[PDB]
Design a protein around this ligand. Sequence first.
Ligand SMILES: CCCCCC#Cc1cn([C@@H]2O[C@H](CO)[C@@H](O)[C@H](O)[C@H]2O)c(=O)[nH]c1=O
Ligand SMILES: CCCCCC#Cc1cn([C@@H]2O[C@H](CO)[C@@H](O)[C@H](O)[C@H]2O)c(=O)[nH]c1=O
Lengths: 810, 810
Amino acid sequence: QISVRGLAGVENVTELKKNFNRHLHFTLVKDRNVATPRDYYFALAHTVRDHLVGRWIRTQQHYYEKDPKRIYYLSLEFYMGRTLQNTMVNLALENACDEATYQLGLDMEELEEIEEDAGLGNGGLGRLAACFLDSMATLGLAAYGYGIRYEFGIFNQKICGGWQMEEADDWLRYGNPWEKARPEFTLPVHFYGRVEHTSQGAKWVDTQVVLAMPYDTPVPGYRNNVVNTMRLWSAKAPNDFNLGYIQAVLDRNLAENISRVLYPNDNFFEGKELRLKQEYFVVAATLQDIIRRFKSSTNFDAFPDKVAIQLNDTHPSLAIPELMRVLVDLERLDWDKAWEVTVKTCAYTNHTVLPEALERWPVHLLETLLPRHLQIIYEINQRFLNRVAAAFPGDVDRLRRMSLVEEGAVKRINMAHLCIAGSHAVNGVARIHSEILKKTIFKDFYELEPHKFQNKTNGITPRRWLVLCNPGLAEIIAERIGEEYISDLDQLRKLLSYVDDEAFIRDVAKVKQENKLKFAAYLEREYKVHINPNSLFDVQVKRIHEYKRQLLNCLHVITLYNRIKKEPNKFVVPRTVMIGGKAAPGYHMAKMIIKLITAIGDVVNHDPVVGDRLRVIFLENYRVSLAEKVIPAADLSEQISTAGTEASGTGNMKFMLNGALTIGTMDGANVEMAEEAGEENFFIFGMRVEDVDRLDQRGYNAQEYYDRIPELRQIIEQLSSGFFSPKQPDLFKDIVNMLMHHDRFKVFADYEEYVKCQERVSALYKNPREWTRMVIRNIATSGKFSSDRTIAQYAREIWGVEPSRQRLPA
Amino acid sequence: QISVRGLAGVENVTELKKNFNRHLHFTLVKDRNVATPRDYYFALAHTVRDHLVGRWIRTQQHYYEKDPKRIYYLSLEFYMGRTLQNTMVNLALENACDEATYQLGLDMEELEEIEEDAGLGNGGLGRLAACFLDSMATLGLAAYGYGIRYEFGIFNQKICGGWQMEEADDWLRYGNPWEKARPEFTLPVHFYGRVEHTSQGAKWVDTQVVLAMPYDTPVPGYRNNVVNTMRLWSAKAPNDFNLGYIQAVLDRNLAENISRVLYPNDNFFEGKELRLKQEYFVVAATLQDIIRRFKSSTNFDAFPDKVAIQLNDTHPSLAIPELMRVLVDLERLDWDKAWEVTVKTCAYTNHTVLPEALERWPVHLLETLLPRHLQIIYEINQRFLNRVAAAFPGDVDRLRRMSLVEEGAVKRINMAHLCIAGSHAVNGVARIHSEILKKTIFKDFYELEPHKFQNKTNGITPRRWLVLCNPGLAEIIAERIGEEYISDLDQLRKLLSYVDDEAFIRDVAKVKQENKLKFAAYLEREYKVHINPNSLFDVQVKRIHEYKRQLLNCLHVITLYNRIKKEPNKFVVPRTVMIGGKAAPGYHMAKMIIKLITAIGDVVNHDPVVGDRLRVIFLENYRVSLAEKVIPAADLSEQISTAGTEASGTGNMKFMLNGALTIGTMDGANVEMAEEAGEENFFIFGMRVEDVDRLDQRGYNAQEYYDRIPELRQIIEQLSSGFFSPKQPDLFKDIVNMLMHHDRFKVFADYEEYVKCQERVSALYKNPREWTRMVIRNIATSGKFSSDRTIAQYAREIWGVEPSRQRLPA
Ligand SMILES: CCCCCC#Cc1cn([C@@H]2O[C@H](CO)[C@@H](O)[C@H](O)[C@H]2O)c(=O)[nH]c1=O
Ligand SMILES: CCCCCC#Cc1cn([C@@H]2O[C@H](CO)[C@@H](O)[C@H](O)[C@H]2O)c(=O)[nH]c1=O
């Protein structure tokens, strides 16, 4: 059909068809009269997977012959989403399969919709991981993602009476044709026990053994025939485990619970033992795989020239004392040498500065669960603190601040401090977040070792986040400037010479209008809800968090509503405000925010005076595959976190790429986005980071805003009095109370300037042609935000390897 | 190589080879340089499974077009063993695959050894089930096996210091290429709740839901292109299950524990709740499958003309009140009509008369777990007892004996009584066991309904139990009389005209000697143990049980040993005595017996005076695949249960088929075996059933035998004094105590005649040529004992359907 989707040749189409039929019959054991859409999706999936394997084998073979330096990306999260379309796209099979399946009388799109998301992640962190593996493959890096194969991913969100209900995401119910179980590289992981000292060093003994079985899933590069591996571990009990008899067998579940469910907090940190076991599990099994792969090439000097380990936040920070444990206790290197190898291997990416988000493990936990690692960590601390004393003699306060060990009611190990100490590079995820790191929470560590601190502004993959979810926009871009930009997204700049081209202007706007028409229909079919597709589409999608200030959005919505009820016969640009996201299950406030949003919907959406001028939709079960649908359909992107809190953000990037304009604060990557497009082409409002500080020193008194803004006073009055909850008039007193007395995020301080800026958005939207020209300026400058750029920067400046864009043979 | 293994044509061989290579690459994602034997076994397995599926689909299609009456075989046990070779054999692919794999430079036999047993059974009962499914397919019956897909089967038995250790049989570790998950026919099963009465009848409510997911495994008939289905259910939790959040997800294991492990008792009955849930699970999910399949053909009159349900013992007896529940409560038939349908559908096979083996469920259990079924059972009882009163007025004792409900400290439901009441046929499993049923435990029920009681002597499948495990013997048979006998085993009779044929005599003996030479080697390679292959091979293999009187064997062994130490320079026919079997984990005595056997081994096997004249081996991990090896290699078969206790036995049949002579008592099928071969061709000793009764009425006093047999007194003295346990001299006091004061099985009563008869075995063995001629008479008369005969008898006399030997098209 459209050109970026590859060739539908007569060979390939005829061949796809017979392989589809072979799978349907031999693999699925069905015939065309009993097959359901789910069987059809499978046959297609097995058929496409057939095109990977040849390439997959040759890629692993290549890395053996060539023995390049290897990148190991350790993450507890890999938010993959669906695999089928991505695979076709990267393999140039999209038009072929589409043709083949059409001729068999099937609609491919209907089949794509049957695939479960692999929701092995909560949000931006696990999805960074996913974009990174795609980019690593595309750039021919010899990279492996390592994580955990959770039996249940992020929960599916149902709304009942406007409250979030969580249900189990049983994504493996029907099988996963993408993975390959490799029970033959099963590895032991040890827990508990005790440390014994001998003539010949420490020995960790009387431990419980849990086996780690790996599953491999192919990661295909973009049209370069590189296929890398994501290896996820699964917990299995040993056969002599516990081994009255029945219970012994039934208790095998106790071990395998390790990889059973993904922790769904991204706000808070809970010191729960299961979580720590998960972190150790992945790190222990991964290091033996890394070490084994290295030995098949006594001398660990070369280890750092052959291995790079990137730590996605501090979740796999135990890699550091685990690498010492192996080197010192099992391979018998002296401390000082093993330490040099360790620091030179490991690097650390921090994803937040929120204090409640940082891992601080109780010592009593590490002591029972991992007693030798505790010894190592203490020995690490001591030697570290002697470096500090030597560099800053007399400074005893610096000593207590920098310690890996927090003194207090319960002793804690600060896992960030460990990562900084044991890594040669530490990075933030956007320029401003990186400066904040050096100026505030890691300032002490920066003065000791300024050379460790870097920046690597996040990016997203334009294969998933443009070609895949937005084929129409990819096409019109390709018509003008070619296809090269799909893996060199800087070329999008060439679009700046089309900014006064009437034919492009109509085409950009035409595509936006289609994506809206299509999403508007998805809203009716799957969820019986009625939207005007000529309205502006105002979307905030991301996890629910106080810092992300969905509440601020709510306040705007309520204000537009109140202005409309005040002058009903005045013209306002209509809007459909969509807000969607999951709340972590114990985060009471977050859950109240979801409730408020639906409450506003019940009032606003059924007011006959409002008409179709304002609609408020909460988007159920936001996740990767819903993001691929709503992002191409959006006009306004809401990125409105209090300055200084959102480390980078990546949703913001997906929207810029797809023709939405951004309303946001100068926070995280928003800053570089505006810098790249010009501030004129951006809707910036609110305090900068400096303003927030000034406010913290005076003290933030919310009353002041309430006393001076009548429009705001009215909203609080409505919330307090029961306007939005006529059955429970006091339903929202917690929010009204938080807003008024302990808002760490200064919702009221930004309200005035946020509303004024929202008025400027409506004004520009009334002039279609200038709206679109601004869109063009955004899309045209979104190049920097490709995860290809990001990965090339890690590669060159942290891992010490060259990206290569060259094909491998077919 | 040999003719019964089919054609190795040039088409098939070349085609096997490329499919093997396709699977190795596409399915297993390996290449010839990294492949391990396990990968090779898989590729072969997937290649052979490819030849089933076409046939499998056409068989299920046929049954739809033709709509014949359907047999549902309900069992908690299916002891399948390995599937690969059986599949090749039934499909005529053995010589082809052997050729193909040879040309790829592989040894097929080495590959066959890598396959796990599906040990979804304990012993004869679950293996009857397996032989029956093979025979049902071979006879073109539209039959389905239904059971449970246990995650762990019968435990693997290790010996440590001569004690049994149990470890978990994790038979699914590496995948099972034979099954097909069919998540789309998932079915709800309900538990707990309570019964509510309405205007419109009872309603079972507030129940917990457990889902049953079916797995299908192909059951290929012998060279007729019929492939039937074994459907095994797997327990899965629902997604809103329990649905702080973490525990909710972790507690999903509580539901799925249902299908987690197979109960390994075959002696005793434990009223454990998990077991009852297993029995209900299988019965509830199976009945909806049966009912659904029936509706796709309001009127249940035809139900019994379209459905037959065979109950393998009382384990799935809840099928009966479950069928009433559905008919009465969900489809709204009146009692009397639903009852007629039920009795006409169901039949019951009893497998034992041992009182501790019978299921008697506590009422408090059924009341909490299945409260409506309890109501039904009471209503069944009442109506049943009114039939009894009417037929035997005044007989109040008969009323208490016949009741489904046992009065007592805790009320129990007698599940046998339920099966008899709710079934149109009840059968024993050998002629003598069937008479015992009618004369003793079911006598009351027989006088009420003599027409319900039948016999169906057990059988075994000659495909697995001859062609497969003994290709050499199958060949020489085929040389003389053709191949037709493989599915018409009566033709083995034609061998009686070769009894004086010198060339056959040498060939029969030649094969026996090979199987011995080969097993003798298997003993060294896998278990470092040293046997003389010219000795007589004396084997007792079967579960360890007091009734099966392994102890009696021990006493003989010890006696041969003591006679040898008394006259060391006298000639005795050498023997290798092998005894093997698992003990149920809580059966303390059984476990002591294993211990004794190894103790005898430690003394006997290291006496230099004994030489290689006597060896005593305990065979570790006896199971289906070890049976396929040791049975062809045996000379003497030990079937020595106290008369009246072994309902039928089937090991006895496997040995007759494979050229061993039998030493045994007149118990179970032994009786019909001797009747078929002539008593002269059999080594019969000991009490008949009548003798046992006479002894029970006088009282069995073991002292008497001890006082009159010096050879016996000496053995007891040795056991008591520590001769076999020099470190723990009192190790065996429990056995010596049981033997002397409470042996329900009269080991001493049979000892004298058992030894005399063992002397007659040794005498005949010294004359090779007459030994073999007797073997010929056994093998030649083993026809009756084919499970094809058995199934044809169920078919004609219980199920009301005709066996058909006709091919279906290819
Ligand atoms: C000391 C160890 C404790 C770590 C606690 C944490 C954290 C997280 C950060 N981010 C986002 O990660 C994204 C990817 O970098 C960012 O764009 C976004 O700004 C982040 O909030 C998440 O999405 N989830 C998180 O849990
Ligand atoms: C009231 C319900 C309770 C049932 C309890 C039971 C039983 C069993 C019978 N048999 C054998 O089943 C075999 C197959 O019929 C026989 O040949 C052999 O003689 C039997 O002992 C077994 O092998 N295992 C058993 O558990």
